[PDB]
């Protein structure tokens, strides 16, 4: 029943939004619908428009003394709020009708559709060495009044508000993730067998990862140490292909694997943000203004492979490293997903 609203600094132009967050069901997205409230006597000759834009923004917005974002406009949409447009698309919405009931004549609804080929709201962790905020893709709604679309923007006229787009976990479990690797010697037939498995393929933040690793060291070398870690992969694509990978959680056990022996164990690794408050380049979930959040939720690609290289893509993997004596170190990897469940 409650309804958010934002107003112009002059107090004359006000916009109402019923929701702050939107979700996608891998086939459709919740439409962005709202109503702008304004008395036409203030303008009496201008026209009101509301614009949807998504940009690759860097830095902060509080008049920092530094070169600001490389403002790449990934996608921009415009709608004519005033003068009134025809009925589509397609009808007015229920909440817009209720708000028009609440206000009356000066209520003007608008409709928008979000294309399916858009990235998710993510924000990179700013570094203490740097200043202000950091780079990150964000959504933004902008409403303004002017006689022309190309008229100069005014602080008193234009109003800026920030919205978010997030995904939620599907209810269908996937195949069981497992991996194996057998490495022999240079000449002798003796080999080194290792197998890694996980309880599930989809987990939840704060839930420990019970990795099941089995080592069949039917060889002559002795494994000195064992290292288990999870790696975060962040694909950066604006006009070139890039990927910045940073370790997030590492666990080491002082276990010796004797030659011609089989050793299997289950280890616990937990990703958390407390220990990485200073690590630059970390990817985090989209924030409102500056509020803290958890780690960046693993966004899942749609069924269509297409391109979808229009922003930041994130994925997680787990690697286990065996410290074999006199070289011969062998490591195995396993991809997995980790992102929020569906609320009610």
């Amino acid at each position: 029943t409650r309804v958010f609203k934002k107003s112009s600094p002059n107090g004359k132009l006000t916009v109402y939004l019923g929701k702050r967050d939107f979700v996608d069901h891998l086939d459709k997205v919740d439409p962005v619908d709202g109503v702008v409230l304004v008395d036409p006597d203030y303008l009496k000759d201008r026209k009101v428009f509301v614009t949807l834009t998504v940009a690759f923004r860097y830095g902060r917005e509080d008049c920092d003394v530094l070169g600001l974002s490389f403002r790449k406009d990934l996608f921009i949409a415009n709608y004519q709020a005033f003068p009134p447009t025809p009925n589509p698309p397609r009808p007015p919405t229920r909440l817009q009708e209720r708000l028009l009931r609440k206000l009356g004549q000066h209520a003007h609804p608008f409709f928008f559709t979000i294309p399916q080929n858009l990235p998710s709201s993510v924000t990179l962790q700013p570094g203490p060495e740097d200043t202000g905020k950091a780079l990150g893709v964000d959504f933004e709604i902008r409403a303004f009044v002017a006689k022309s679309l190309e008229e100069k923007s005014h602080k008193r006229n234009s109003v800026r508000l920030v919205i978010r787009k997030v995904q939620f976990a599907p209810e269908k479990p996937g195949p069981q993730p497992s991996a194996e690797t057998t490495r022999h010697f240079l000449m002798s037939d003796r080999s080194l067998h290792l197998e890694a498995s996980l309880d599930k393929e989809l987990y939840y933040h704060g839930e420990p990862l019970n990795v099941n690793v089995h080592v069949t060291n039917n060889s002559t070398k002795t494994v000195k140490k064992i290292k288990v870690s999870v790696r975060q992969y962040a694909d950066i694509v604006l006009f070139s292909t890039a990927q910045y990978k940073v370790p997030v959680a590492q666990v080491e056990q002082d276990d010796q694997v004797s030659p011609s022996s089989t050793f299997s164990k289950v280890y616990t690794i937990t990703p958390f943000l407390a220990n990485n408050r200073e690590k630059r380049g970390l990817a985090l979930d989209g924030k409102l203004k500056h509020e803290d959040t958890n780690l960046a939720s693993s966004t899942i690609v749609k069924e269509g492979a297409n391109k979808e290289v229009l922003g930041i893509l994130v994925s997680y993997r787990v690697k286990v490293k065996l410290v074999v004596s006199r070289g011969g170190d062998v490591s195995v990897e396993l991809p997995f997903v980790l992102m929020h469940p569906k609320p009610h």
């Binding site: 409650r2 309804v3 958010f4 609203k5 107003s7 209720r98 708000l99 009931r101 609440k102 508000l161």
Partner: peptide
């Protein structure tokens, strides 16, 4: 300033 909720009525 900031954001705020408000009445819905009916």
């Amino acid at each position: 300033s900031f954001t705020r909720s408000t009445v819905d009525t009916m």
